[PDB]
Design a protein around this ligand. Structure first.
Ligand SMILES: C=CC1=C(C)[C@@H](Cc2[nH]c(/C=C3N=C(/C=C4\NC(=O)[C@H](C)[C@H]4CC)C(C)=C\3CCC(=O)O)c(CCC(=O)O)c2C)NC1=O
Ligand SMILES: C=CC1=C(C)[C@@H](Cc2[nH]c(/C=C3N=C(/C=C4\NC(=O)[C@H](C)[C@H]4CC)C(C)=C\3CCC(=O)O)c(CCC(=O)O)c2C)NC1=O
Ligand SMILES: C=CC1=C(C)[C@@H](Cc2[nH]c(/C=C3N=C(/C=C4\NC(=O)[C@H](C)[C@H]4CC)C(C)=C\3CCC(=O)O)c(CCC(=O)O)c2C)NC1=O
Ligand SMILES: C=CC1=C(C)[C@@H](Cc2[nH]c(/C=C3N=C(/C=C4\NC(=O)[C@H](C)[C@H]4CC)C(C)=C\3CCC(=O)O)c(CCC(=O)O)c2C)NC1=O
Ligand SMILES: C=CC1=C(C)[C@@H](Cc2[nH]c(/C=C3N=C(/C=C4\NC(=O)[C@H](C)[C@H]4CC)C(C)=C\3CCC(=O)O)c(CCC(=O)O)c2C)NC1=O
Ligand SMILES: C=CC1=C(C)[C@@H](Cc2[nH]c(/C=C3N=C(/C=C4\NC(=O)[C@H](C)[C@H]4CC)C(C)=C\3CCC(=O)O)c(CCC(=O)O)c2C)NC1=O
Ligand SMILES: C=CC1=C(C)[C@@H](Cc2[nH]c(/C=C3N=C(/C=C4\NC(=O)[C@H](C)[C@H]4CC)C(C)=C\3CCC(=O)O)c(CCC(=O)O)c2C)NC1=O
Ligand SMILES: C=CC1=C(C)[C@@H](Cc2[nH]c(/C=C3N=C(/C=C4\NC(=O)[C@H](C)[C@H]4CC)C(C)=C\3CCC(=O)O)c(CCC(=O)O)c2C)NC1=O
Ligand SMILES: C=CC1=C(C)[C@@H](Cc2[nH]c(/C=C3N=C(/C=C4\NC(=O)[C@H](C)[C@H]4CC)C(C)=C\3CCC(=O)O)c(CCC(=O)O)c2C)NC1=O
Ligand SMILES: C=CC1=C(C)[C@@H](Cc2[nH]c(/C=C3N=C(/C=C4\NC(=O)[C@H](C)[C@H]4CC)C(C)=C\3CCC(=O)O)c(CCC(=O)O)c2C)NC1=O
Ligand SMILES: CCC1=C(C)/C(=C/C2=NC(=C\c3[nH]c(/C=C4\NC(=O)[C@H](C)[C@H]4CC)c(C)c3CCC(=O)O)/C(CCC(=O)O)=C2C)NC1=O
Lengths: 160, 162, 172, 227, 162, 172, 162, 172
């Protein structure tokens, strides 16, 4: 969170929070209701984003659902869409947090080591999250999907 | 179990076919007799006990050697009397089932199949049960179409044992 | 195979009793409502082809996988097999709608079937979506207030939806 | 000429006497030529034999044989010869034969003509040899001219599944064309496995959080609704 | 011919069996629908002509090309019109027979079997007759149970051609 | 497919030898006693139905489970199936009593008893008790000093109780 | 799949037999016609696009109601028009397959089997495609024996749909 | 079954394409060499019996196990079954030599076979030695410069030796 980052920052500097950081906290706590609207909409539209993003993923990338692919089969496809559900949840956490810290520590720190240990192409994962970014930008406003879409963009920059 | 309903389903299943209007006419005809069938079914359950006792007593009065023959298979013990009333109880039970279902399917399933081999291996006599069913057919006390629904099936078991 | 009746009498004989008065009375109520049942099954059969083909259009329109060349609707012959399988499952749902009990539908069609659409590489999940495309259509034709007197059929329509949900639950 | 090797023997339903005086139901309709059926009942026999060998799926117009029908309706053949010339027809060979791994086509022959499951693996072995050398012809000659098939179907009867359902019990045995469908479990393995099967998995989605866990009351719900 | 009656006697005959109570219930149910069946059958016969002419006219209005193509199959001659009304007349006839008999036996016997080969060899689309039968299903003018008896069979033929 | 003789010949040929004098002499002894074997098989056949029915009376008398409803002797048809299955196993014991070797008993009746019963919900342990009701009676009629002059046949009653114990051991 | 080769191997397999001189003569005859077959196969693939578009256009000009009829089954949509060229593309594809293989086996396997049930359940007229194939047969532009190799199979599909 | 051609068409249709000009040109080359293939298949069929029996002589001469009693060549029926199995494998190698593609050889004969010679107690390694006795003889008759004009056939003998190695690799 932004509060956590500021407190840790001036804590390692062993001082109280400066005015610049307290203004940052004010801007954050006043921007709250907008954030909660966005994560509310991505919450209550999750099945459209996972399903439709999975369709655009598998239609753009017929590798992994082909025979011999990481996700070939019913169980494997279900697990693939399960992970897209995870990253959707984590994006919503990053929206309400006002910071990518929730996303980074739950989902991104050591993700490449995991998917390399599973045999999974992580570029397919990044294409999946980009597909959910397109659907979630189709469900929101202009500036709104700019904000949320840029949270998705952080996750894509961590995968690539 | 052979119902009218399962008969219709079974025939149109064998023809690889939906139910047409024919089968539905058949199911209609089962439903329009079912009320008299249940009137018949309730009264037989309503006094089944006295029908059993009267029936076994009539079997004894017609065949007096049964109560006197020293044997395992004869009601000269305290066992063949209770087992006599047990089997008569079974027939009357199956008739009440067939009155509820609306064909002889419960009697053909639970009773009729393989009964000759029982009455051949256990030295049982078909006539004994015939006499029992004649008493039940004479003394059930139904009236009208309910009585025809009872006497149809009660006659049917006599056709089986003869 | 067992209807509504033969289940009650089969339980009662399997315990070896007479039918109590309570069972007889409820069975009288089922006989007293049986025309509605016939009506539904009439309204399915007389529209059955249309149900099948419209649910097929919906299915292949929403999942355009299957008819593309590597799918299962792609082969013209496989395509015909797909259609008539839908006709089959509709046929047994009609049977179990008449009999009242899921007996003929649970031994002749559904039993063994999920094993079979795993020996052919056919997506049974897609088959359950087809059944979900037939339930909608079949109930939507079942609730047609046309040529039939007005009344209450929710208690039966709900029963109808049981069987279509049971086929979808049993091919997956 | 190297007869068929001695194999074992199992115990299925077809070898007992379910006396069943006065048949309940489930006795496959006697679709024959003995009852001198008119035009319709002839068509029902013809359709029943088609379902029997080809089954519902392979009973399409292209597959249907006009000529053996026209001979059968006019009395030029027996029903047994119709079933034989059915299996020799090549539309049955392109589908159910060219796909089946030789030991498996033995299933659908001993089982679609005799109406009984195979006794053990050894049966599949021996009969697969005789169809591997003599050709399909003499194998079907073996099954049809066998003492068994003459003992229960004779000259004019469509074969059925013998004793599929025991008296009273509903379940019995799975229907036959259901049991050995066509394609087989390992036939594909040699080729490309069927590609592009994903979308059915996509159309149905459950979140992991929604899935029942051990010890909840909901898992047993189905049992409660059956009582 | 497949009636309910010949179906029940055929089944009981194949089981090597007398007519039990089940099949008699089925024949009863045929008799207690047969009055509505005959009321439906008499009005169809009573105005068969106008049903045919109106049907063929509806087919022409829906498909305008049929009256305009210069071909033997199409009703652009003075012959395809008469033959058009001929075929529609056949279907209405068969429906009246099946309303009298009580199953789809006459249509399945005289009409349904082999019809694909006719409509494949003579280039006639399945829909034409579908359109015809839709007009007859809309304009037979029956009421109540007689209308259900007519619409069952008239739908049935549409299930055949589709 | 292999009597007592053809098993010895089958072993000897499977090793591809001549029959040694020792095998031939014991085989001479078997032929020299085989009249008693025919006598026992005559005394089984000619009483076989009575054996079965009396052991059935004993069975249902000692275990009153089976006939009172819910058991397996309760259905009339199922009752007769019980009896007949006892007739089957007595038939094959008669066969393997004639042949000398448990060959016909181990391929034609033994193979399908355990699998089928556990598929019928039948207590196979109760089946083995039925066979233990038949062993008693069968030996008791085999040792009937009646109509035949006296001799020693314990040597052959051991050979008969083996088969009855083998069936009881093989349905369980 | 029915090739000449698999036909000969299938027959000699059914006779429990090696390949004698007869089947080798058959495969010879396939080899010495295959050159013209492939020349025909190359030109059809070489301009398949314009064959498809010209074919759908010809179907539209013959049958103007198809582009005007409101329904799902008619090319009055953007989509209906798009599908049309899909199916015509399928016919041209299978003809090119049969020209390569040398029998009608790819068309009999992938295309011919079950075609009536599709054109019966989805209301697709046999003629539409007939008109399409007539245009393909008239405008492929082959000469000589290659044209006979194309027109054999193009005629063959018309014999299937009629 | 599939030949050389139907494999290409089967792949192309399974992806739903036309054949490109490059596939057609290579296919022209295959048609342009097909005479040689017929020549080899002629030289196998017209010597096939002799191939089989001479490879049998070699096999039983080098392994004297199987005929001396206890083995599988010992019984006359088994000895004949062994011979004709060699004829079977030679028959399908001839088929797959004509068709060009290992398709008829990989579904009717080889597939499942190693499983079969493990249900019979037969050493499939000895079967592979028998096939190695047929490969040498068959190639040695394939390279007979007799009655046939001169040319180059190494590229096709390299296509014949594959199938015999595939059967030997697949029974083991
Ligand atoms: C479901 C249908 C059904 C039947 C039809 C009966 C049939 C039946 N009855 C008996 C057995 C018997 N049945 C009777 C009955 C009587 N014997 C007489 O002499 C009297 C006249 C008569 C009573 C009126 C008797 C006494 C026995 C035991 C001894 C015997 O065999 O006679 C047995 C052997 C098992 C036992 O001992 O209980 C069977 C299968 N049981 C059933 O479950
Ligand atoms: C003055 C005194 C007097 C009587 C006592 C009756 C007696 C009587 N009942 C019937 C005739 C009948 N009686 C009944 C009555 C019934 N049958 C059933 O099964 C039901 C249980 C029961 C109604 C409760 C029936 C149904 C008939 C006609 C058929 C028959 O004989 O059962 C007849 C023959 C003439 C006819 O058909 O009407 C006579 C004389 N009539 C009289 O005039
Ligand atoms: C008594 C009940 C009963 C059933 C329920 C069916 C089930 C069934 N379907 C098939 C067979 C088939 N079933 C389908 C159907 C499908 N096509 C698809 O695109 C969908 C996934 C699916 C329809 C929803 C297809 C395409 C085949 C043929 C498969 C093939 O040959 O590749 C087979 C093998 C025999 C055959 O080819 O017909 C069987 C047993 N058969 C029965 O006897
Ligand atoms: C042989 C064929 C055959 C049928 C097809 C039915 C047809 C049928 N339905 C009803 C009668 C009826 N049918 C319906 C049915 C419904 N009404 C609604 O508003 C819902 C749309 C629909 C749900 C299924 C109702 C509500 C009645 C009247 C109530 C009743 O009779 O129970 C009746 C009573 C007599 C009459 O109304 O004239 C008959 C004969 N019965 C048959 O024998
Ligand atoms: C027992 C039932 C039975 C039927 C249902 C008919 C069906 C039928 N119709 C035709 C034949 C025909 N049917 C029509 C009818 C049509 N004209 C059009 O404009 C419409 C599309 C359509 C009326 C709705 C025409 C025009 C022909 C002649 C076609 C031709 O020769 O081109 C033929 C071929 C023999 C003939 O020429 O008469 C047959 C079998 N015949 C039967 O025996
Ligand atoms: C084809 C069928 C066939 C048979 C079934 C037998 C039956 C048979 N057994 C004996 C003869 C005999 N059988 C027995 C057997 C018995 N010893 C006893 O302790 C028991 C009671 C009983 C065995 C269970 C004895 C002991 C004799 C000799 C009797 C004597 O000489 O005293 C004889 C007289 C000839 C002889 O001495 O062998 C015959 C015909 N023979 C046949 O050909
Ligand atoms: C070739 C050898 C051979 C056998 C050995 C039998 C074995 C056997 N028994 C049954 C079937 C049966 N077997 C019995 C027998 C029993 N009743 C009991 O009380 C006892 C536990 C037991 C006798 C000791 C019964 C009751 C059934 C019917 C079971 C049922 O339907 O519930 C079945 C199923 C088919 C049928 O219903 O007949 C089979 C295969 N059949 C054969 O073909
Ligand atoms: C393997 C071979 C093979 C074929 C040849 C096709 C044949 C075919 N076409 C359709 C289906 C269709 N085909 C067309 C085509 C037409 N549009 C018109 O205006 C013309 C009359 C015609 C083109 C000339 C249309 C419009 C549909 C959809 C019909 C509808 O849904 O109403 C369907 C049903 C499934 C679907 O909707 O796609 C099938 C099996 N499919 C195959 O798998
Ligand atoms: C199409 C493929 C195909 C196969 C792979 C074979 C496989 C096969 N072999 C046998 C059967 C047999 N196979 C052999 C072969 C021999 N046993 C030996 O010990 C020798 C080493 C070896 C010869 C080299 C023998 C001897 C038998 C008969 C006895 C046995 O099982 O060993 C059988 C049983 C039927 C019969 O007896 O013929 C089968 C299915 N058959 C086929 O049709
Ligand atoms: C029906 C059966 C049947 C056959 C078996 C063949 C046999 C055959 N081969 C050739 C012809 C030929 N066959 C070969 C084959 C050979 N190349 C070599 O290096 C090897 C020695 C040998 C392969 C093992 C060659 C090279 C020619 C052409 C010879 C030439 O023109 O010089 C010819 C002359 C016609 C032609 O040129 O094709 C014939 C009839 N043809 C048939 O119709
Ligand atoms: C909250 C943070 C978090 C994540 C993301 C996570 C992922 C995760 N993914 C897994 C598997 C998997 N994940 C995939 C994913 C894919 N396959 C593809 O081709 C595509 C590119 C991609 C889908 C878009 C597949 C195929 C497997 C299973 C692979 C196998 O088991 O063989 C597993 C293995 C066991 C299990 O799932 O229960 C974990 C733990 N775990 C976590 O704690």
């Amino acid at each position: 969170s932004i509060v956590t980052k500021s407190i840790v920052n001036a804590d390692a500097e062993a001082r109280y929070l400066s005015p610049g950081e307290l203004e940052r906290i004010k801007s954050f706590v006043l921007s709250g209701q907008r954030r909660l609207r966005i994560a509310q909409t991505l919450t209550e539209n999750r099945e459209m984003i996972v399903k439709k993003g999975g369709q655009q993923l598998f239609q753009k990338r017929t590798d992994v659902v082909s025979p011999g692919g990481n996700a070939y089969g019913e169980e494997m496809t279900a697990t693939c869409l399960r992970d897209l559900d995870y990253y959707l949840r984590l994006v919503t956490y990053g929206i309400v947090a006002g910071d990518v810290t929730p996303i980074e520590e739950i989902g991104l720190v050591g993700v490449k080591e995991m998917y390399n240990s599973l045999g999974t192409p992580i570029s397919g994962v990044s294409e999946g999250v980009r597909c959910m970014k397109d659907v979630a930008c189709s469900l929101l406003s202009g500036e709104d999907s700019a904000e949320a879409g840029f949270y998705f963009d952080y996750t894509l920059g961590a995968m690539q | 179990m052979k119902t009218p309903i399962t008969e219709a389903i079974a025939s149109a299943d064998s023809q690889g076919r939906f139910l047409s209007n024919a089968e539905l006419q058949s199911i209609t005809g089962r439903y329009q007799r079912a009320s008299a069938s249940l009137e018949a079914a309730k009264q037989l359950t309503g006094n089944a006990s006295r029908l059993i006792t009267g029936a076994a007593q009539a079997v004894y009065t017609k065949f007096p050697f049964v109560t006197q023959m020293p044997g395992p298979t004869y009601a000269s013990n305290a066992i063949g009397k209770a087992k006599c009333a047990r089997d008569i109880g079974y027939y009357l039970r199956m008739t009440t089932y067939c009155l509820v279902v609306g064909a002889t399917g419960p009697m053909d399933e639970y009773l009729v199949a393989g009964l000759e081999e029982i009455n051949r291996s256990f030295e049982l006599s078909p006539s004994w049960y015939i006499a029992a069913l004649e008493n039940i057919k004479n003394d059930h006390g139904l009236s009208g179409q309910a009585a025809n629904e009872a006497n149809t099936y009660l006659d049917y078991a006599i056709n089986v044992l003869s | 195979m067992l209807d509504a009746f033969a289940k009650v009498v089969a339980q009662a004989d399997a315990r070896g009793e007479f039918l109590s008065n309570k069972q007889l009375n409820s069975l009288e109520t089922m006989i007293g409502e049986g025309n509605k049942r016939l009506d539904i099954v009439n309204k399915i059969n007389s529209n059955a082809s249309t149900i099948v083909t419209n649910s097929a259009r919906a299915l292949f329109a929403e999942q355009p996988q299957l008819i593309q060349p590597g799918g299962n609707a792609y082969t013209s012959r496989r395509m015909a097999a797909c259609l008539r399988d839908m006709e089959i499952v509709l046929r047994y749902v009609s049977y179990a709608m008449t009999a009242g009990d899921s007996s003929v539908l649970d031994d002749r069609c559904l039993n063994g079937l999920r094993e079979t659409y795993q020996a052919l590489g056919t997506p049974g999940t897609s088959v359950a979506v087809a059944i979900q495309k037939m339930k909608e259509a079949s109930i939507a034709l079942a609730n047609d207030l046309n040529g039939v007197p007005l009344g209450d059929c929710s208690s039966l329509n709900s029963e109808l939806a049981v069987y279509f949900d049971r086929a979808a639950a049993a091919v997956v | 000429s190297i007869p068929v090797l001695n194999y074992s023997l199992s115990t299925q339903n077809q070898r007992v006497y379910s006396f069943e005086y006065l048949p309940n139901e489930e006795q496959p309709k006697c679709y024959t030529t003995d009852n001198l059926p008119a035009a319709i009942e002839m068509d029902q026999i013809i359709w029943a034999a088609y379902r029997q060998i080809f089954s519902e799926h392979q009973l399409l117009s292209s597959t249907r044989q006009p000529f053996l029908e026209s001979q059968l309706r006019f009395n030029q053949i027996t029903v047994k010869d119709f079933i034989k010339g059915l299996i020799l027809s090549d539309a049955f060979r392109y589908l159910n034969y060219d796909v089946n791994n030789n030991y498996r086509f033995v299933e659908m022959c001993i089982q679609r003509i005799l109406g009984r499951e195979i006794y053990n693996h050894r049966e599949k072995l021996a009969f697969a040899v005789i169809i591997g050398s003599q050709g399909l012809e003499a194998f079907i000659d073996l099954l049809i001219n066998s003492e068994e098939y003459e003992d229960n179907f004779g000259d004019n009867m469509i074969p059925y599944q013998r004793r599929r359902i025991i008296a009273q019990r509903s379940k019995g045995e799975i229907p036959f064309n259901l049991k050995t469908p066509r394609l087989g479990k390992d036939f594909l393995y040699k080729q490309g496995m069927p590609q592009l099967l994903w979308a059915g998995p996509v159309h149905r989605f459950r979140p992991q959080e929604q899935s029942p866990k051990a010890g909840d009351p909901a898992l047993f719900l189905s049992m409660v609704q059956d009582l």
